[PDB]
């Protein structure tokens, strides 16, 4: 007793919210519940794509190392995404995470040089701090202004152990020499589901400004800003975990009553 | 009934932070499943106010009838109800006792919060739900909450003197901050466990006593695994996503050892 146009909206909402590395499982659940593969393919096509761009899904392209991220910044319409490192275009199936059709592509050599020096120095940083990390660096014009967008993804999927986790960084550097405007979002998400459903969601906005020079010299400085900002974030997380554990948790339920012993139920009943 | 299994599987994957709003939608999506979902999907407990005796009570599906809820204090429905599901006068008396018992239990382990106990009649015995909600203080920088949902089943044997208890317990644990250091951080959700035991029903050891011991054990055992999962496991996962100190060539290399190994 709710409109079919609404039902698909809910189904779409559910899909977009699938925990990291559990898209399939959520999708199957949603499909079987809606019971209308016709509604799904229309009113939810938007959701499959949005989720992948939202989650910075890494994908292997055949004959290339290494992987590239599916973001909104690589979206070219059609169903094609850009790999700025290899300067190639490729097709993507959002349902089965498949990268077909490697196609040489021409980059706007406006920023090419700045982009390479970042993509280069960020590669090294990712390698150093993200065990299973991937990154993709874009260089494109936004409102007449040259922007460099660095995206980092790192995940650990262990469905057999009923837990999954993912880190996503998005750093935007709008470059207006002699200054650059830094704007970032850092996201963490962890899902544990052995005999329950426990999740950590956290994000941090970061905003900063810096003085620029030569492309190589400030690519290096960009990375330092990233390193510092992310370390502080991970530290803050670990510090907050500490506080949560030995302060606010202890304050919710005691471990034993103030009598340092288990409850005498006879006393309780008279 | 394969439908329900999907809904419940979905509920264990969608972020527990939006349990209430998601269940609302899930039911709209599959209205036939409503009655079933409402009884098998746990939600953060709400507090209502029994205006008659002036005391708070907790709300779940087991004291709901229609859109009204039964206060364990005045034994009446709110908003008032024509013909609502009640307990037999025999059971009501045990209920009122179980509420007093678990009220003390609450005080003993939580030093505050709210508890409510609802009993209902079964076939060869009875069932109960024990609810406890405790909130942390707005003095400290971190919001916290603890919801306990213990559902017990009692199957009395024909003799008396011995009975079989089935306990299904869920604890929902919610932690959250806007400390500028880490933006927003919400760590929430729940765990569920099962105990199943036979025990002596004497005068020195009645039903409430038997149920109590079971609850106490489970809650102590969960409090433990909670601490270990919330502040142990989920954190380690975080730390396995990113490392502050630059990754040491040893793990970098141990990792290549295993990556190469996984060749189809």
């Amino acid at each position: 007793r709710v409109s079919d146009e609404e039902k698909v909206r809910i189904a779409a909402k559910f899909i977009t919210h699938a925990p990291p590395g559990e898209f399939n499982e959520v999708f199957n659940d949603v499909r079987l519940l809606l019971n209308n593969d016709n509604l799904l393919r229309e009113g939810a096509a938007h959701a499959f794509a949005q989720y992948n761009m939202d989650q910075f899904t890494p994908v292997k392209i055949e004959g290339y190392d290494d992987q590239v991220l599916i973001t909104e910044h690589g979206d070219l319409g059609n169903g094609r995404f850009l790999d700025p490192r290899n300067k190639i275009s490729f097709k993507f199936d959002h349902l089965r995470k498949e990268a077909s059709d490697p196609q040489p592509e021409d980059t706007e050599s406006a920023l090419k040089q700045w982009r390479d020096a970042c993509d280069s120095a960020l590669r090294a940083y990712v390698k150093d701090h993200y065990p299973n990390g991937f990154c993709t660096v874009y260089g494109k014009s936004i409102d007449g202004q040259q922007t460099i967008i660095a995206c980092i993804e790192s995940h650990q999927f262990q469905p057999k152990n009923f837990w999954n986790g993912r880190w996503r960084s998005e750093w935007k550097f709008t470059i207006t020499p002699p200054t650059a405007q830094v704007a970032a979002v850092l996201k963490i998400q962890v899902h544990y589901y052995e005999d329950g459903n426990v999740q950590l969601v956290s994000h941090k906005d970061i905003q900063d400004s810096v003085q620029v020079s030569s492309d190589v010299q400030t690519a290096k400085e960009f990375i330092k800003i990233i390193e510092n900002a992310e370390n502080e974030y991970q530290t803050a997380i670990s510090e907050n975990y500490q506080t949560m554990s030995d302060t606010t948790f202890k304050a919710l339920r005691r471990q034993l009553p103030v009598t340092r012993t288990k409850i005498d139920w006879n006393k309780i009943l008279s | 009934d394969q439908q329900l299994d999907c809904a419940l599987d979905l509920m264990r994957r969608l972020p527990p932070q939006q349990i209430e709003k998601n269940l609302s939608d899930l039911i709209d999506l599959v209205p036939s499943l409503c009655e079933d979902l409402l009884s098998s999907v746990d939600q953060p407990l709400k507090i209502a106010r029994d205006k008659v005796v002036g005391k708070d009570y907790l709300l779940c599906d087991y004291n709901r009838d229609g859109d009204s809820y039964r206060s364990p204090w005045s034994n009446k429905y709110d908003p008032p109800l024509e013909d609502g599901a009640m307990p037999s006068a025999r059971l009501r008396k045990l209920e009122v006792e179980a509420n007093n018992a678990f009220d003390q239990y609450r005080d003993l382990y939580f030093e505050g919060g709210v508890s409510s106990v609802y009993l209902w009649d079964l076939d060869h015995g009875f069932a109960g739900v024990i609810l406890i909600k405790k909130a942390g203080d707005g003095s400290k920088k971190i919001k916290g909450c603890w919801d306990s949902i213990h559902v017990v089943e009692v199957q009395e044997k024909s003799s008396g003197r011995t009975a079989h208890y089935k306990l299904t317990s869920t604890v929902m644990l919610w932690l959250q901050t806007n400390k500028t250091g880490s933006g927003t951080m919400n760590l929430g959700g729940s765990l569920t466990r099962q105990m199943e035991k036979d025990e002596t029903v004497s005068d020195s050891s009645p039903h409430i006593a038997n149920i109590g011991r079971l609850v106490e054990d489970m809650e102590n055992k969960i409090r433990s695994t909670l601490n270990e999962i919330y502040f142990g496991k989920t954190k380690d996962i975080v730390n396995g996503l990113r490392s502050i100190d630059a990754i040491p060539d040893n793990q970098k290399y141990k990792q290549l050892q295993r990556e190469l190994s996984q060749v189809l």
């Binding site: 199957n28 | 299994d5 419940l8 264990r12 009884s39 009838d65 069932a127 099962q194």
Partner: peptide
């Protein structure tokens, strides 16, 4: 067009709340 996607958890996730005692309401929600 279309598909039933491959999960790799092996075991179905088991829902403990199913086997809890049911309770008969005198009207539905």
């Amino acid at each position: 067009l279309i598909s039933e996607l491959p999960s790799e958890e092996g075991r179905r996730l088991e829902h403990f709340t199913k086997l809890r005692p049911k309770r008969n309401k005198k009207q539905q929600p």
